[PDB]
Amino acid sequence: SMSYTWTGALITPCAAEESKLPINPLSNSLLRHHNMVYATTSRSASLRQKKVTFDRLQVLDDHYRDVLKEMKAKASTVKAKLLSIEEACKLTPPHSAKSKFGYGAKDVRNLSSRAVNHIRSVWEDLLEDTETPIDTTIMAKSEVFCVQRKPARLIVFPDLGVRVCEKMALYDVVSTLPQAVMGSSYGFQYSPKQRVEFLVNTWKSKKCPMGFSYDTRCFDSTVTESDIRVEESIYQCCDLAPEARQAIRSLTERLYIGGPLTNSKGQNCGYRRCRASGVLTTSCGNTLTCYLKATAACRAAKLQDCTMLVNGDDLVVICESAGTQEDAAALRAFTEAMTRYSAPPGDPPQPEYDLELITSCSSNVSVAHDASGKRVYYLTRDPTTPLARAAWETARHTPINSWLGNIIMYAPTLWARMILMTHFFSILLAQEQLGKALDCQIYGACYSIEPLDLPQIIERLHGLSAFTLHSYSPGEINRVASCLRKLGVPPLRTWRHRARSVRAKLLSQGGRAAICGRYLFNWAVRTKLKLTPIPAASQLDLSGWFVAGYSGGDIYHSLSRAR
């Protein structure tokens, strides 16, 4: 069936859309080539629509059925809880899209009578009606990139009341089931230092390793109605409350497998028969689907001793080499199997024999040295998109601060330390906002984080070595320096000067600012301050941070205030 059908009504914006980086002194201090930075808008939606619309022709085989049964046997160990309306309301981000039924996210969080009554009505309707398709809105996503243009991605999501119901039925399932089923291959269970450790140990565990990333083209569009029912069959192996079982059954047929698309103006836009990006099961469902197809495809291809790492549609496989020619042929066979399963490739995969040459979640393992000169592995990435987005976030207030998520996840990197920490600490210190909580996203869930708490967060996620790395690889330094020239970002020497300046000011303030000056900017001086474990680090409650993925799932993981 066709992934989408369209009526001809346009994908419309709900307000004016900005596509150009503003010319602003603060952003210009970071990046001078403002014309290279753009944001996608609804104006390119038609180009995306063409790319994502195609027929799927899936063929399943014994390897696929075998792997599915293995996955279901592990899912059969799970007991999932139904969340109460209160619990589910507390997981709603404060800025989540309002309902068309007369209330918004703040009303949901406050347990307002109108919100709760409506949510209860939507729940009862899921229990009673197993068929009526649930409406969804389709919008063009606004994302920032550097030129060399990408057309906007399309997001599809149901009303706020439905989203709260999805949490009640499935939040515990999508939080617990993926690890139970996929074990160590489930990527979202790892903090950054744990992900590096898994990749390095997996690589070194092979006698003669070979690895590869597999890029599926337009993954969400490749997901079939069969795939979404197979995913449901895995969820149904959990012990579930009867109302949760019915809600899952109803949501599967009424929302997850497909449904009508309405634009921002209320016009009937088309019909979807593939994965919606903006529902609670997207991350878990995609991960399970990718894992199932790939695990089966590895068997078809006769790849030996595979170990996969999967996060949504992002897949990396590390196996035992059978020799160069044998590996090349096996990878072609793997791709052929994936294609039969409706997961055709974007870039054809290539075998790699160096761990550093593999890219997963757009990141690669690199090496630096700590204060003692000992090797430390850490994950880095090309900093182009992070810097372009940081520039946009400097000129405009945005709902998610990618820069803060990037400092958290990429803290050990040369570019996050020299450029992102320096730039934002400088501006926030001047504005007396070092302690103002900002929203950021980690594995798709939203968190409200005060930049002054960064040192202890970094220590937990990466280790104290994140504050001492030096002697970065020549390859990594070259990629950063090349990026800076391309984007017109000032050279590293300028960043060192700015860092010494903000470091002095932070130290002068005492308190949490001084801990930031000491730990975050020790790299900027020769006269190192002593770094010890931060007392606050051991008390940090990071429960919930690296448990599961929730991208598109409308999840907020910070604490709800008492009423």
Side-chain angles (χ1 to χ4, degrees), residues 219-252:
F219 192 101
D220 287 357
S221 281
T222 73
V223 175
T224 63
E225 295 159 276
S226 177
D227 292 335
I228 292 156
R229 293 180 171 125
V230 161
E231 172 185 347
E232 185 207 1
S233 81
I234 296 172
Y235 302 155
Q236 293 282 4
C237 289
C238 290
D239 182 274
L240 290 162
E243 289 192 356
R245 206 171 276 293
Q246 181 66 63
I248 291 173
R249 177 89 279 274
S250 292
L251 285 167
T252 292

PDB file of all heavy atoms in Angstrom, residues 219-252:
ATOM      1  N   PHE A 219      12.804   5.893   6.861  1.00  0.00           N
ATOM      2  CA  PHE A 219      12.337   4.777   7.678  1.00  0.00           C
ATOM      3  C   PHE A 219      10.844   4.800   8.036  1.00  0.00           C
ATOM      4  O   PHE A 219      10.186   3.788   7.907  1.00  0.00           O
ATOM      5  CB  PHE A 219      13.217   4.581   8.940  1.00  0.00           C
ATOM      6  CG  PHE A 219      12.967   3.296   9.668  1.00  0.00           C
ATOM      7  CD1 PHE A 219      13.817   2.194   9.521  1.00  0.00           C
ATOM      8  CD2 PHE A 219      11.946   3.219  10.619  1.00  0.00           C
ATOM      9  CE1 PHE A 219      13.602   1.019  10.211  1.00  0.00           C
ATOM     10  CE2 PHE A 219      11.721   2.040  11.288  1.00  0.00           C
ATOM     11  CZ  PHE A 219      12.552   0.945  11.119  1.00  0.00           C
ATOM     12  N   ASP A 220      10.331   5.931   8.493  1.00  0.00           N
ATOM     13  CA  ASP A 220       8.925   5.951   8.950  1.00  0.00           C
ATOM     14  C   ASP A 220       8.010   5.511   7.792  1.00  0.00           C
ATOM     15  O   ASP A 220       7.022   4.805   8.016  1.00  0.00           O
ATOM     16  CB  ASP A 220       8.486   7.310   9.481  1.00  0.00           C
ATOM     17  CG  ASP A 220       9.088   7.643  10.849  1.00  0.00           C
ATOM     18  OD1 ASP A 220       9.792   6.797  11.400  1.00  0.00           O
ATOM     19  OD2 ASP A 220       8.936   8.805  11.273  1.00  0.00           O
ATOM     20  N   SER A 221       8.327   5.943   6.577  1.00  0.00           N
ATOM     21  CA  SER A 221       7.469   5.582   5.425  1.00  0.00           C
ATOM     22  C   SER A 221       7.573   4.122   5.071  1.00  0.00           C
ATOM     23  O   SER A 221       6.663   3.597   4.406  1.00  0.00           O
ATOM     24  CB  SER A 221       7.881   6.393   4.201  1.00  0.00           C
ATOM     25  OG  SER A 221       7.342   7.691   4.303  1.00  0.00           O
ATOM     26  N   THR A 222       8.704   3.472   5.397  1.00  0.00           N
ATOM     27  CA  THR A 222       8.877   2.077   5.095  1.00  0.00           C
ATOM     28  C   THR A 222       8.127   1.140   6.047  1.00  0.00           C
ATOM     29  O   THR A 222       7.976  -0.055   5.772  1.00  0.00           O
ATOM     30  CB  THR A 222      10.378   1.644   5.048  1.00  0.00           C
ATOM     31  OG1 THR A 222      10.892   1.613   6.385  1.00  0.00           O
ATOM     32  CG2 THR A 222      11.222   2.616   4.190  1.00  0.00           C
ATOM     33  N   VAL A 223       7.717   1.681   7.205  1.00  0.00           N
ATOM     34  CA  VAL A 223       6.996   0.865   8.187  1.00  0.00           C
ATOM     35  C   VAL A 223       5.581   0.560   7.683  1.00  0.00           C
ATOM     36  O   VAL A 223       4.803   1.476   7.414  1.00  0.00           O
ATOM     37  CB  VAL A 223       6.964   1.646   9.526  1.00  0.00           C
ATOM     38  CG1 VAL A 223       6.105   0.906  10.598  1.00  0.00           C
ATOM     39  CG2 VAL A 223       8.383   1.811  10.056  1.00  0.00           C
ATOM     40  N   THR A 224       5.282  -0.727   7.587  1.00  0.00           N
ATOM     41  CA  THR A 224       4.007  -1.178   7.015  1.00  0.00           C
ATOM     42  C   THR A 224       2.931  -1.407   8.081  1.00  0.00           C
ATOM     43  O   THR A 224       3.229  -1.512   9.287  1.00  0.00           O
ATOM     44  CB  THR A 224       4.215  -2.485   6.263  1.00  0.00           C
ATOM     45  OG1 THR A 224       4.649  -3.488   7.200  1.00  0.00           O
ATOM     46  CG2 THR A 224       5.268  -2.344   5.145  1.00  0.00           C
ATOM     47  N   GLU A 225       1.693  -1.619   7.627  1.00  0.00           N
ATOM     48  CA  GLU A 225       0.603  -1.942   8.562  1.00  0.00           C
ATOM     49  C   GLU A 225       0.951  -3.259   9.264  1.00  0.00           C
ATOM     50  O   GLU A 225       0.781  -3.389  10.488  1.00  0.00           O
ATOM     51  CB  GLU A 225      -0.709  -2.019   7.765  1.00  0.00           C
ATOM     52  CG  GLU A 225      -1.000  -0.597   7.205  1.00  0.00           C
ATOM     53  CD  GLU A 225      -1.935  -0.518   6.008  1.00  0.00           C
ATOM     54  OE1 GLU A 225      -1.473  -0.695   4.830  1.00  0.00           O
ATOM     55  OE2 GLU A 225      -3.063  -0.016   6.249  1.00  0.00           O
ATOM     56  N   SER A 226       1.535  -4.199   8.528  1.00  0.00           N
ATOM     57  CA  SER A 226       1.967  -5.452   9.120  1.00  0.00           C
ATOM     58  C   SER A 226       2.994  -5.193  10.231  1.00  0.00           C
ATOM     59  O   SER A 226       2.911  -5.776  11.308  1.00  0.00           O
ATOM     60  CB  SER A 226       2.565  -6.404   8.065  1.00  0.00           C
ATOM     61  OG  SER A 226       3.065  -7.618   8.649  1.00  0.00           O
ATOM     62  N   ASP A 227       4.001  -4.365   9.935  1.00  0.00           N
ATOM     63  CA  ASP A 227       4.998  -4.061  10.958  1.00  0.00           C
ATOM     64  C   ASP A 227       4.348  -3.518  12.260  1.00  0.00           C
ATOM     65  O   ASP A 227       4.812  -3.862  13.359  1.00  0.00           O
ATOM     66  CB  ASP A 227       5.987  -2.978  10.471  1.00  0.00           C
ATOM     67  CG  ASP A 227       6.881  -3.456   9.339  1.00  0.00           C
ATOM     68  OD1 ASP A 227       7.116  -4.684   9.222  1.00  0.00           O
ATOM     69  OD2 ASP A 227       7.439  -2.544   8.675  1.00  0.00           O
ATOM     70  N   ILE A 228       3.347  -2.642  12.125  1.00  0.00           N
ATOM     71  CA  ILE A 228       2.729  -2.003  13.290  1.00  0.00           C
ATOM     72  C   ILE A 228       1.859  -2.990  14.068  1.00  0.00           C
ATOM     73  O   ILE A 228       1.858  -2.976  15.305  1.00  0.00           O
ATOM     74  CB  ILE A 228       1.987  -0.705  12.847  1.00  0.00           C
ATOM     75  CG1 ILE A 228       3.060   0.337  12.400  1.00  0.00           C
ATOM     76  CG2 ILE A 228       1.180  -0.128  14.047  1.00  0.00           C
ATOM     77  CD1 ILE A 228       2.576   1.419  11.431  1.00  0.00           C
ATOM     78  N   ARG A 229       1.267  -3.961  13.366  1.00  0.00           N
ATOM     79  CA  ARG A 229       0.535  -5.037  14.062  1.00  0.00           C
ATOM     80  C   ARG A 229       1.496  -6.053  14.720  1.00  0.00           C
ATOM     81  O   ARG A 229       1.186  -6.635  15.768  1.00  0.00           O
ATOM     82  CB  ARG A 229      -0.470  -5.717  13.135  1.00  0.00           C
ATOM     83  CG  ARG A 229      -1.598  -4.750  12.742  1.00  0.00           C
ATOM     84  CD  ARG A 229      -2.593  -5.459  11.811  1.00  0.00           C
ATOM     85  NE  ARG A 229      -3.785  -4.636  11.590  1.00  0.00           N
ATOM     86  CZ  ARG A 229      -4.218  -4.301  10.390  1.00  0.00           C
ATOM     87  NH1 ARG A 229      -3.559  -4.723   9.310  1.00  0.00           N
ATOM     88  NH2 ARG A 229      -5.287  -3.539  10.271  1.00  0.00           N
ATOM     89  N   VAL A 230       2.661  -6.273  14.089  1.00  0.00           N
ATOM     90  CA  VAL A 230       3.678  -7.158  14.659  1.00  0.00           C
ATOM     91  C   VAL A 230       4.218  -6.500  15.935  1.00  0.00           C
ATOM     92  O   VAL A 230       4.377  -7.149  16.963  1.00  0.00           O
ATOM     93  CB  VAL A 230       4.807  -7.418  13.640  1.00  0.00           C
ATOM     94  CG1 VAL A 230       6.097  -7.939  14.350  1.00  0.00           C
ATOM     95  CG2 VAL A 230       4.298  -8.467  12.603  1.00  0.00           C
ATOM     96  N   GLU A 231       4.459  -5.200  15.882  1.00  0.00           N
ATOM     97  CA  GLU A 231       4.876  -4.464  17.068  1.00  0.00           C
ATOM     98  C   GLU A 231       3.810  -4.637  18.185  1.00  0.00           C
ATOM     99  O   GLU A 231       4.134  -4.926  19.348  1.00  0.00           O
ATOM    100  CB  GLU A 231       4.996  -2.978  16.650  1.00  0.00           C
ATOM    101  CG  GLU A 231       5.231  -1.998  17.765  1.00  0.00           C
ATOM    102  CD  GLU A 231       5.214  -0.572  17.254  1.00  0.00           C
ATOM    103  OE1 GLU A 231       5.257  -0.398  16.008  1.00  0.00           O
ATOM    104  OE2 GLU A 231       5.105   0.339  18.097  1.00  0.00           O
ATOM    105  N   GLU A 232       2.549  -4.478  17.812  1.00  0.00           N
ATOM    106  CA  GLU A 232       1.475  -4.651  18.795  1.00  0.00           C
ATOM    107  C   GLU A 232       1.527  -6.072  19.379  1.00  0.00           C
ATOM    108  O   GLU A 232       1.324  -6.262  20.587  1.00  0.00           O
ATOM    109  CB  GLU A 232       0.100  -4.389  18.214  1.00  0.00           C
ATOM    110  CG  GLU A 232      -0.966  -4.475  19.320  1.00  0.00           C
ATOM    111  CD  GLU A 232      -2.368  -4.882  18.831  1.00  0.00           C
ATOM    112  OE1 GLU A 232      -2.553  -5.134  17.624  1.00  0.00           O
ATOM    113  OE2 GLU A 232      -3.285  -4.923  19.686  1.00  0.00           O
ATOM    114  N   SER A 233       1.800  -7.070  18.533  1.00  0.00           N
ATOM    115  CA  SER A 233       1.832  -8.470  19.017  1.00  0.00           C
ATOM    116  C   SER A 233       2.922  -8.648  20.088  1.00  0.00           C
ATOM    117  O   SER A 233       2.752  -9.416  21.033  1.00  0.00           O
ATOM    118  CB  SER A 233       2.014  -9.471  17.831  1.00  0.00           C
ATOM    119  OG  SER A 233       3.376  -9.580  17.437  1.00  0.00           O
ATOM    120  N   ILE A 234       3.994  -7.857  19.997  1.00  0.00           N
ATOM    121  CA  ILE A 234       5.030  -7.871  21.018  1.00  0.00           C
ATOM    122  C   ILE A 234       4.494  -7.192  22.302  1.00  0.00           C
ATOM    123  O   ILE A 234       4.628  -7.757  23.393  1.00  0.00           O
ATOM    124  CB  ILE A 234       6.295  -7.191  20.501  1.00  0.00           C
ATOM    125  CG1 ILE A 234       6.838  -8.001  19.316  1.00  0.00           C
ATOM    126  CG2 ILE A 234       7.361  -7.124  21.623  1.00  0.00           C
ATOM    127  CD1 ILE A 234       8.018  -7.278  18.587  1.00  0.00           C
ATOM    128  N   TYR A 235       3.879  -6.020  22.171  1.00  0.00           N
ATOM    129  CA  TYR A 235       3.281  -5.367  23.345  1.00  0.00           C
ATOM    130  C   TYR A 235       2.269  -6.250  24.049  1.00  0.00           C
ATOM    131  O   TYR A 235       2.210  -6.243  25.278  1.00  0.00           O
ATOM    132  CB  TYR A 235       2.580  -4.056  22.951  1.00  0.00           C
ATOM    133  CG  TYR A 235       3.459  -3.025  22.284  1.00  0.00           C
ATOM    134  CD1 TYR A 235       2.894  -2.078  21.447  1.00  0.00           C
ATOM    135  CD2 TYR A 235       4.834  -3.013  22.503  1.00  0.00           C
ATOM    136  CE1 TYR A 235       3.714  -1.095  20.858  1.00  0.00           C
ATOM    137  CE2 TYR A 235       5.659  -2.081  21.909  1.00  0.00           C
ATOM    138  CZ  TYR A 235       5.090  -1.165  21.046  1.00  0.00           C
ATOM    139  OH  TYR A 235       5.899  -0.201  20.490  1.00  0.00           O
ATOM    140  N   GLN A 236       1.505  -7.030  23.285  1.00  0.00           N
ATOM    141  CA  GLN A 236       0.435  -7.854  23.851  1.00  0.00           C
ATOM    142  C   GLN A 236       0.949  -9.029  24.673  1.00  0.00           C
ATOM    143  O   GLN A 236       0.159  -9.652  25.410  1.00  0.00           O
ATOM    144  CB  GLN A 236      -0.536  -8.333  22.764  1.00  0.00           C
ATOM    145  CG  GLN A 236      -1.352  -7.211  22.117  1.00  0.00           C
ATOM    146  CD  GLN A 236      -2.532  -6.721  22.983  1.00  0.00           C
ATOM    147  OE1 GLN A 236      -2.731  -7.156  24.130  1.00  0.00           O
ATOM    148  NE2 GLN A 236      -3.239  -5.719  22.485  1.00  0.00           N
ATOM    149  N   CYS A 237       2.252  -9.315  24.566  1.00  0.00           N
ATOM    150  CA  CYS A 237       2.875 -10.368  25.400  1.00  0.00           C
ATOM    151  C   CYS A 237       3.090  -9.886  26.851  1.00  0.00           C
ATOM    152  O   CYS A 237       3.388 -10.704  27.720  1.00  0.00           O
ATOM    153  CB  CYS A 237       4.236 -10.757  24.822  1.00  0.00           C
ATOM    154  SG  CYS A 237       4.034 -11.668  23.272  1.00  0.00           S
ATOM    155  N   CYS A 238       2.972  -8.568  27.124  1.00  0.00           N
ATOM    156  CA  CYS A 238       3.145  -8.105  28.488  1.00  0.00           C
ATOM    157  C   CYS A 238       1.937  -8.515  29.324  1.00  0.00           C
ATOM    158  O   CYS A 238       0.814  -8.638  28.792  1.00  0.00           O
ATOM    159  CB  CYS A 238       3.120  -6.564  28.493  1.00  0.00           C
ATOM    160  SG  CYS A 238       4.591  -5.813  27.714  1.00  0.00           S
ATOM    161  N   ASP A 239       2.137  -8.601  30.639  1.00  0.00           N
ATOM    162  CA  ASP A 239       0.987  -8.664  31.552  1.00  0.00           C
ATOM    163  C   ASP A 239       0.455  -7.212  31.555  1.00  0.00           C
ATOM    164  O   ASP A 239       1.219  -6.260  31.813  1.00  0.00           O
ATOM    165  CB  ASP A 239       1.410  -9.039  32.963  1.00  0.00           C
ATOM    166  CG  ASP A 239       0.203  -9.149  33.887  1.00  0.00           C
ATOM    167  OD1 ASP A 239      -0.215  -8.117  34.429  1.00  0.00           O
ATOM    168  OD2 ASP A 239      -0.389 -10.247  33.950  1.00  0.00           O
ATOM    169  N   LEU A 240      -0.840  -7.056  31.270  1.00  0.00           N
ATOM    170  CA  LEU A 240      -1.468  -5.734  31.138  1.00  0.00           C
ATOM    171  C   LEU A 240      -2.819  -5.722  31.847  1.00  0.00           C
ATOM    172  O   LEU A 240      -3.562  -6.715  31.849  1.00  0.00           O
ATOM    173  CB  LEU A 240      -1.792  -5.470  29.661  1.00  0.00           C
ATOM    174  CG  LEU A 240      -0.546  -5.247  28.759  1.00  0.00           C
ATOM    175  CD1 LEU A 240      -0.869  -5.429  27.264  1.00  0.00           C
ATOM    176  CD2 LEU A 240       0.132  -3.905  29.036  1.00  0.00           C
ATOM    177  N   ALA A 241      -3.163  -4.539  32.351  1.00  0.00           N
ATOM    178  CA  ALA A 241      -4.498  -4.338  32.902  1.00  0.00           C
ATOM    179  C   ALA A 241      -5.449  -4.495  31.711  1.00  0.00           C
ATOM    180  O   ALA A 241      -5.098  -4.196  30.567  1.00  0.00           O
ATOM    181  CB  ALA A 241      -4.618  -2.936  33.479  1.00  0.00           C
ATOM    182  N   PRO A 242      -6.670  -4.969  31.954  1.00  0.00           N
ATOM    183  CA  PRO A 242      -7.585  -5.174  30.817  1.00  0.00           C
ATOM    184  C   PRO A 242      -7.837  -3.883  30.020  1.00  0.00           C
ATOM    185  O   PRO A 242      -7.879  -3.905  28.802  1.00  0.00           O
ATOM    186  CB  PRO A 242      -8.902  -5.657  31.463  1.00  0.00           C
ATOM    187  CG  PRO A 242      -8.683  -5.591  32.944  1.00  0.00           C
ATOM    188  CD  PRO A 242      -7.217  -5.443  33.244  1.00  0.00           C
ATOM    189  N   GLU A 243      -7.984  -2.759  30.710  1.00  0.00           N
ATOM    190  CA  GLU A 243      -8.250  -1.525  29.972  1.00  0.00           C
ATOM    191  C   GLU A 243      -6.999  -1.130  29.156  1.00  0.00           C
ATOM    192  O   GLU A 243      -7.136  -0.533  28.086  1.00  0.00           O
ATOM    193  CB  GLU A 243      -8.646  -0.392  30.920  1.00  0.00           C
ATOM    194  CG  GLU A 243     -10.028  -0.598  31.525  1.00  0.00           C
ATOM    195  CD  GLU A 243     -10.615   0.625  32.242  1.00  0.00           C
ATOM    196  OE1 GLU A 243      -9.938   1.697  32.375  1.00  0.00           O
ATOM    197  OE2 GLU A 243     -11.794   0.473  32.702  1.00  0.00           O
ATOM    198  N   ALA A 244      -5.799  -1.408  29.677  1.00  0.00           N
ATOM    199  CA  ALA A 244      -4.573  -1.110  28.905  1.00  0.00           C
ATOM    200  C   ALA A 244      -4.565  -2.024  27.662  1.00  0.00           C
ATOM    201  O   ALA A 244      -4.201  -1.589  26.578  1.00  0.00           O
ATOM    202  CB  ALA A 244      -3.296  -1.376  29.761  1.00  0.00           C
ATOM    203  N   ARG A 245      -4.919  -3.310  27.811  1.00  0.00           N
ATOM    204  CA  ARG A 245      -4.924  -4.179  26.627  1.00  0.00           C
ATOM    205  C   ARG A 245      -5.867  -3.645  25.536  1.00  0.00           C
ATOM    206  O   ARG A 245      -5.537  -3.605  24.334  1.00  0.00           O
ATOM    207  CB  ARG A 245      -5.331  -5.610  27.023  1.00  0.00           C
ATOM    208  CG  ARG A 245      -4.826  -6.700  26.120  1.00  0.00           C
ATOM    209  CD  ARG A 245      -5.139  -8.066  26.799  1.00  0.00           C
ATOM    210  NE  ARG A 245      -4.200  -8.581  27.802  1.00  0.00           N
ATOM    211  CZ  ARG A 245      -2.950  -8.985  27.541  1.00  0.00           C
ATOM    212  NH1 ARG A 245      -2.447  -8.860  26.296  1.00  0.00           N
ATOM    213  NH2 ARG A 245      -2.206  -9.514  28.496  1.00  0.00           N
ATOM    214  N   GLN A 246      -7.078  -3.239  25.942  1.00  0.00           N
ATOM    215  CA  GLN A 246      -8.009  -2.699  24.971  1.00  0.00           C
ATOM    216  C   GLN A 246      -7.487  -1.357  24.390  1.00  0.00           C
ATOM    217  O   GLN A 246      -7.616  -1.109  23.187  1.00  0.00           O
ATOM    218  CB  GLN A 246      -9.402  -2.522  25.595  1.00  0.00           C
ATOM    219  CG  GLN A 246     -10.405  -1.970  24.524  1.00  0.00           C
ATOM    220  CD  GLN A 246     -10.639  -2.981  23.413  1.00  0.00           C
ATOM    221  OE1 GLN A 246     -11.155  -4.089  23.665  1.00  0.00           O
ATOM    222  NE2 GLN A 246     -10.235  -2.638  22.186  1.00  0.00           N
ATOM    223  N   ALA A 247      -6.962  -0.466  25.243  1.00  0.00           N
ATOM    224  CA  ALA A 247      -6.474   0.806  24.710  1.00  0.00           C
ATOM    225  C   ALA A 247      -5.367   0.568  23.674  1.00  0.00           C
ATOM    226  O   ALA A 247      -5.316   1.268  22.660  1.00  0.00           O
ATOM    227  CB  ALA A 247      -5.955   1.670  25.854  1.00  0.00           C
ATOM    228  N   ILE A 248      -4.478  -0.382  23.934  1.00  0.00           N
ATOM    229  CA  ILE A 248      -3.389  -0.690  22.994  1.00  0.00           C
ATOM    230  C   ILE A 248      -3.980  -1.220  21.675  1.00  0.00           C
ATOM    231  O   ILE A 248      -3.511  -0.854  20.578  1.00  0.00           O
ATOM    232  CB  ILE A 248      -2.421  -1.678  23.657  1.00  0.00           C
ATOM    233  CG1 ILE A 248      -1.683  -0.905  24.798  1.00  0.00           C
ATOM    234  CG2 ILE A 248      -1.408  -2.277  22.574  1.00  0.00           C
ATOM    235  CD1 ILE A 248      -0.814  -1.818  25.661  1.00  0.00           C
ATOM    236  N   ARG A 249      -4.940  -2.155  21.783  1.00  0.00           N
ATOM    237  CA  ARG A 249      -5.609  -2.702  20.596  1.00  0.00           C
ATOM    238  C   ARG A 249      -6.279  -1.566  19.799  1.00  0.00           C
ATOM    239  O   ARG A 249      -6.142  -1.474  18.572  1.00  0.00           O
ATOM    240  CB  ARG A 249      -6.647  -3.741  21.068  1.00  0.00           C
ATOM    241  CG  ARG A 249      -7.475  -4.349  19.943  1.00  0.00           C
ATOM    242  CD  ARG A 249      -6.804  -5.613  19.333  1.00  0.00           C
ATOM    243  NE  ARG A 249      -5.763  -5.284  18.359  1.00  0.00           N
ATOM    244  CZ  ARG A 249      -5.980  -5.039  17.067  1.00  0.00           C
ATOM    245  NH1 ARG A 249      -7.230  -5.029  16.561  1.00  0.00           N
ATOM    246  NH2 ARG A 249      -4.924  -4.809  16.265  1.00  0.00           N
ATOM    247  N   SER A 250      -7.050  -0.720  20.486  1.00  0.00           N
ATOM    248  CA  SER A 250      -7.742   0.392  19.836  1.00  0.00           C
ATOM    249  C   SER A 250      -6.764   1.408  19.239  1.00  0.00           C
ATOM    250  O   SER A 250      -6.941   1.821  18.102  1.00  0.00           O
ATOM    251  CB  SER A 250      -8.680   1.088  20.825  1.00  0.00           C
ATOM    252  OG  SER A 250      -9.764   0.205  21.152  1.00  0.00           O
ATOM    253  N   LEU A 251      -5.766   1.824  20.008  1.00  0.00           N
ATOM    254  CA  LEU A 251      -4.783   2.775  19.474  1.00  0.00           C
ATOM    255  C   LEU A 251      -4.087   2.198  18.259  1.00  0.00           C
ATOM    256  O   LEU A 251      -3.810   2.923  17.304  1.00  0.00           O
ATOM    257  CB  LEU A 251      -3.754   3.128  20.524  1.00  0.00           C
ATOM    258  CG  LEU A 251      -4.303   4.086  21.586  1.00  0.00           C
ATOM    259  CD1 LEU A 251      -3.300   4.132  22.768  1.00  0.00           C
ATOM    260  CD2 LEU A 251      -4.449   5.513  21.038  1.00  0.00           C
ATOM    261  N   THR A 252      -3.756   0.910  18.303  1.00  0.00           N
ATOM    262  CA  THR A 252      -3.084   0.294  17.134  1.00  0.00           C
ATOM    263  C   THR A 252      -3.902   0.435  15.860  1.00  0.00           C
ATOM    264  O   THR A 252      -3.395   0.878  14.814  1.00  0.00           O
ATOM    265  CB  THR A 252      -2.761  -1.193  17.426  1.00  0.00           C
ATOM    266  OG1 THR A 252      -1.744  -1.256  18.452  1.00  0.00           O
ATOM    267  CG2 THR A 252      -2.212  -1.887  16.160  1.00  0.00           C
TER     268      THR A 252
END
